[PDB]
Write a protein that binds this DNA or RNA. Structure first.
Ligand SMILES: [K+]
Ligand SMILES: [Mg+2]
Ligand SMILES: [Mg+2]
Ligand SMILES: [Mg+2]
Ligand SMILES: [Mg+2]
Ligand SMILES: [Mg+2]
Lengths: 126, 206, 292, 126
RNA sequence: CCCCACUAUGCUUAGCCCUAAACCUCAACAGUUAAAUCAACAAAACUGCUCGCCAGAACACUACGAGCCACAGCUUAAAACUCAAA
């Protein structure tokens, strides 16, 4: 009335802060391009950006945690961790589709390594 | 700082370590044992276990230095010492038999005594309380007056009135003047002691 | 909370995994040890994460799991310990033992155990004042003429201060083709890097890059810096030095050579003299360098 | 009145300060308070009453020795209540607030400055 | 309020006046220390017996009447109106 009367779960990657990237956390993407003397770092980063967007859009609400984008030679391993909510047939169809799409996208032998988990693996709570 | 807080300053005193264990007190024994555990900083370029080392002259040389040119500062210091030595030898050769016993020829003794003769024990501290600045007498610490003597000597030797007289020659003359309680630096000490006696009624503001 | 069944199962999985890892590495599972577990896990799963606890580990479940559950009374209800009803049976039993030893004696580098690890040993929470009382009793026991059982009993409650900084590495003494003994060492100051060889016997000749030291170092300050090590331990004119310095400037090179000569001279002096040099700052690398 | 039970359980301001200063000096002139206080020869610089008359601060000149200063402080703090009682008993003031003995810090500066000006060289007849 | 001066008065004699936080804020006598000692505080809790006094607050140490060496005095001492408190 009168004026005077008036007067969250987190996974391992989410839980740990960025200053543990080389102490506790790791690197999701692993490529030689960024090393000293190696070239094409920006190209690899652009590929990583698109690849993460396309995985998260091709597996909506399925990925339990972030991908791991490994590259050896011309190979491109997406080691992803997903849930057990979708039917296995849909997972197989999406794996085939995304593998072929990315292999013709980058002209390189892309591959997927889906790892299903029952639910989000919470590390702690913030 | 690139040293961690654990690092301690080194002790360069050479005869301290040769002290017999029998002479060591329990406290001194304890601290000697304690230093074993501590980390010690690297000794800086400068002080050394040399028997000719003089911290006062080193500080004077550092205070004369300009732009980090330490070689030139030490050159000026040694030239001043040599000039004082030669002037005293010249005065000694021309003195009477009885007058040669009271003529000091050691440049280090002259330097130390000349600086000691210029040390002020009282100074002033500008303090504005009532809207007007008030200079109040305050007793000077030993380090403060040791610094002030050196600063006054160097500033007096840096005056532009001394045209083309090289720094070693001016500094030797000023040192020999202050050795005999003469010259403008002794007068600057006296004018501070007088101007602090003229305001002994302002000590109540402290 | 981890039930005892859970820990039992984890022990089982650790044992089967131990035999599996032994099979994978080709070593004999019978003699396969925990150090072998650590090394094999490091090899199979490389990780340069600085935190050693963030790296892969396969430890025995006993060390990992903080599960504790101690029963203080049996099915009949009678407590096992005669000091149970005090609530601090372990602490008061220890105090009783200490007091009994003190009575017996009356008839006749390291640190004290800190409060938290005393609680860990007793497996009982205790306050500050009772810890102080226990430490006072231990000190009193030390003051008396402690016999054998007494001082190993006290040693149970004294940890080791492993921070002895007198750990300068004495360079091994080498021998040249002429049979002369010498020692080599390195040093660094700013961008200057020096390597010095000090001979056990000599006439005080220092050769810097094959040049006499008074010719290589015109400035007296550098020569005093080269003096400082030998003069500090009263052996001027008793050794020969052959040093090579590169990079940096006059003062940085002089400091690097001083450090190198001190570290090489540590070989021919006593341990007490090594410690005196360390306390004088003659054996420490100067970490001060230009800042961005 | 069962004392057993009780024991167990501004121009005006300047005039009052002057009166209290005179009274306290007269009290310290004799062993009326105690012989230990009398032997100390305590001297007062001033008396200041707080603006709300909640405390009386008596500033006593300090000496150079520190042990004597500590002893003087102890005796004065132990004697303050007795001096308050004497002041009201003599009817110097009807009500005296609690007396707090404060060390006069200013006088030491002048003392040190005097001990230095004694030995100073000022120059030739100037 | 502080300083100076000075009265009634404080003193004696002979009469009055009859009031005080005139209070140990405990009525006088006799008795007990056993019971749950005992609202609280004050000052440990009670018993027998007797006199005096009290029955919501305020109006009210008041009005009127009466008595008094008192005459702006003292003792005794109400009612009306009002309130849900005191
Ligand atoms: K009363
Ligand atoms: Mg009375
Ligand atoms: Mg009666
Ligand atoms: Mg009656
Ligand atoms: Mg009534
Ligand atoms: Mg009446």
């Amino acid at each position: 009335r009168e004026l005077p009367c008036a007067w969250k779960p987190v996974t391992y990657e989410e839980a740990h802060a960025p200053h543990y990237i080389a102490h506790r956390k790791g690197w999701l993407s692993l490529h030689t391009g960024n090393l000293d003397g190696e070239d094409h770092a920006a190209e690899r980063t652009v590929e990583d950006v698109f690849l993460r967007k396309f995985m998260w859009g091709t597996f909506p609400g399925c990925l339990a945690d972030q991908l791991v984008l490994k590259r050896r030679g011309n190979q491109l391993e997406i080691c992803a961790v997903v849930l057990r909510q979708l039917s296995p047939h849909k997972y197989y169809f999406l794996v085939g589709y995304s593998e072929t799409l990315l292999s013709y996208f980058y002209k390189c032998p892309v591959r997927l390594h889906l790892q299903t988990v029952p639910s989000k693996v919470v590390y702690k709570y913030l | 700082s690139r040293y961690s807080p654990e690092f301690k300053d080194p002790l360069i005193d050479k005869e301290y370590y040769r002290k017999p264990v029998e002479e060591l007190t329990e406290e001194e024994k304890y601290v000697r044992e304690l230093k074993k555990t501590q980390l010690i900083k690297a000794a800086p370029a400068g002080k050394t276990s040399s028997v000719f080392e003089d911290p006062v002259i080193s500080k004077f040389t550092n205070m004369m230095m300009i732009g980090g040119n330490k070689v030139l500062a030490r050159s000026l210091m040694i030239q001043t010492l040599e000039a004082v030595k030669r002037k005293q030898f010249e005065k000694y050769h021309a003195a009477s038999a009885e007058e040669q016993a009271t003529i000091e020829r050691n440049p280090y003794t002259i330097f130390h005594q000349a600086l000691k003769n210029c040390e002020p024990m009282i100074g002033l501290v500008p303090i504005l309380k009532g809207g007007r600045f008030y200079q109040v007498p305050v007793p000077l610490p030993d380090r403060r007056r040791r610094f002030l003597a050196m600063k006054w000597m160097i500033t007096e030797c840096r005056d532009k009135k001394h045209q083309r007289t090289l720094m070693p020659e001016k500094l030797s003359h000023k040192l020999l003047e202050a050795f005999h309680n003469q010259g403008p630096v002794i007068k600057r000490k006296h004018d501070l002691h007088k101007m602090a006696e003229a305001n002994r009624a302002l000590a109540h503001y402290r | 909370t981890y039930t005892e069944d859970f820990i039992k199962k984890q022990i089982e999985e650790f044992n089967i995994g131990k035999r599996h890892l032994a099979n994978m590495m080709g070593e004999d599972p019978e003699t396969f040890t925990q150090e072998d577990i650590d090394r094999a896990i490091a090899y199979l799963f490389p990780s340069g994460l600085f935190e050693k606890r963030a790296r892969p580990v396969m430890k025995h479940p006993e060390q990992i799991f903080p599960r504790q559950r101690a029963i203080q009374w049996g099915e009949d209800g009678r407590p096992f310990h005669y000091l149970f009803y005090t609530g601090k049976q372990s602490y008061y039993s220890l105090m009783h033992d200490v007091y009994g030893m003190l009575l017996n004696l009356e008839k006749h580098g390291s640190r004290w155990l800190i409060k938290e690890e005393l609680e860990e040993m007793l497996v009982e929470k205790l306050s500050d004042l009772d810890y102080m009382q226990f430490i006072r009793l231990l000190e009193k026991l030390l003051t008396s003429q402690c016999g054998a059982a007494e001082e190993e009993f006290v040693q149970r409650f004294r940890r080791s201060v492993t921070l002895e900084s007198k750990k300068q590495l004495i360079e091994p003494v080498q021998y040249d083709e002429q049979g002369m003994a010498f020692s080599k060492s390195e040093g660094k100051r700013k961008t200057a890097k020096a390597e010095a060889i000090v001979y056990k016997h000599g006439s005080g000749r220092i050769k810097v890059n094959g040049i006499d030291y008074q010719l290589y170092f015109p400035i007296t300050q550098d020569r005093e810096q080269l003096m400082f090590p030998f003069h500090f331990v009263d052996r001027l004119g008793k050794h020969d030095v052959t040093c090579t310095v590169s990079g940096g400037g006059r003062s940085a090179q002089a400091g690097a050579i001083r450090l190198a000569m001190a570290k090489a001279l540590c070989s021919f002096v006593t341990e007490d003299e090594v410690e005196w040099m360390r306390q004088a700052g003659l054996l420490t690398t100067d970490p001060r360098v230009r800042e961005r | 009145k069962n004392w057993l039970k009780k024991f167990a359980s501004h121009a005006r301001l300047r005039a009052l300060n002057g009166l209290l200063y005179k009274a306290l000096t007269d009290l310290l002139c004799t062993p009326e308070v105690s012989q230990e206080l009398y032997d100390l020869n305590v001297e007062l610089s001033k008396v200041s009453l707080t603006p709300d008359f909640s405390a009386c601060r008596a500033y006593w000149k300090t000496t150079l020795s520190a042990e004597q200063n500590a002893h003087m402080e102890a005796v004065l703090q132990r004697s303050a209540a007795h001096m308050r009682h004497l002041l009201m008993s003599q009817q110097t003031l009807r009500n005296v607030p609690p007396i707090v003995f404060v060390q006069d810090k200013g006088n030491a500066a002048l003392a040190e400055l005097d001990q230095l000006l004694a030995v100073a060289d000022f120059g030739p007849r100037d």
